[model samples]
Target: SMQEEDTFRELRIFLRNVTHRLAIDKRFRVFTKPVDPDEVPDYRTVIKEPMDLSSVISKIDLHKYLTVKDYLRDIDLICSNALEYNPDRDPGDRLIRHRACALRDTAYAIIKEELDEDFEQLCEEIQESR
Candidate 1:
């Protein structure tokens, strides 16, 4: 028996739209480029798995994302890495880390918006998956 794949690409398009909206934010510019080990040498060391918005789009292009959870993980990864590298202790790190937290928060809101009435399902499933 064959299950249809029609909704799969639909999800992909959904993911792409979500990320595209996020990517449009000017603050998102800081993370669009690949992290340069040469530039922030310590970034490569602390961040075991580095990810940027551009990387996410490429993954979408290659059909790497499969579910809401998969996309959420990567979005969190980008923000999490920023949060990991920049702590709130130091004044500069606080400024730098703020973006990550805000971006993560915004990501959820946008994702929920994209999910439409499934917002309840989106929230519950994400929490349930945790």
Candidate 2:
């Protein structure tokens, strides 16, 4: 129960902070299917380029925003635990291993135009550490 409580807290914090911010960005759009309300109910809606978010926010599954955050958290945990007991682990190899994930997070930050000098330096630091 304690573990579940922690997970929920993390999820809620992420949703209220990170996910909410990202969802507000106009560039992000999620693919979704709509059910037609008619005599013969239809359930096919062909996806088109430049998909738009419906004004109905209820239709959006905001939880998807949690996916990347959860992924990063998972990988970071694994990496941290792996390094905990290994005093001689190659820091460069570890950096390289998680480079893609770091870059991916950075890319999203770039999209949000939230990448600052500090983040740029962090990327360089990762490169240098590798």
Candidate 3:
């Protein structure tokens, strides 16, 4: 039972560490909050699966994501959805798409390096406690 608690905290901590990095980035700030359908009329139609940093954190705190992969998928979804909808053609669209691409790449790099290592260390520490 204690193992369950450790696993849960590790996943959420890793996810939060990954997302908060993006949240504070001005270029990626747009992706930090839920896209308003009213502001971008076709956003909902274009992005059937919308995602954002705030929502992911909420899901983390709520334990809605069963594993780290689940959280990562949503982060990927956020970038993919933006790039798809904007397509990088128009000037304004280019900004959105560019930032989305950067955000996705940044998230991947963080997870692959720091967060993954930390997660493993935490898991091993938990195992050692037994």
How do the residues 28-113 of candidate 1 rate in per-residue lDDT, one tens digit apiece? 77877788779888877788999998899999879776567778898889888888788769787887678777778898998766
Candidate 1 structure, TM-score to reference:
0.81
List the candidate numbers ranked by lDDT, top first: 3, 1, 2
lDDT of each: 0.76, 0.37, 0.79
Top lDDT hit: 3
lDDT of 2 by residue, 48-104 (tens): 221212321231234332233333453243334323323355885455345433433
Report the error of model 3 at residue 34, Å: 1.5
Question: Which residues of candidate 3, in runs, are more than 4 Å off?
Answer: 117-130
TM-scores for the candidates: 0.81, 0.27, 0.82
Error of 3 at 84 (Å): 1.2
Q: Residue 40's C-alpha lDDT in candidate 2?
A: 21
Winner by TM-score between candidate 3 and candidate 2:
3
TM-score of 3: 0.82
In the range 1-130, model 3's lDDT, one tens digit per residue, is 7766878787777778877878998898788888776888778876787888898888888978655556778888898888888885779999998888999888888877775565656655655665
Poorly placed runs, candidate 1 (over 4 Å): 1-3, 116-130
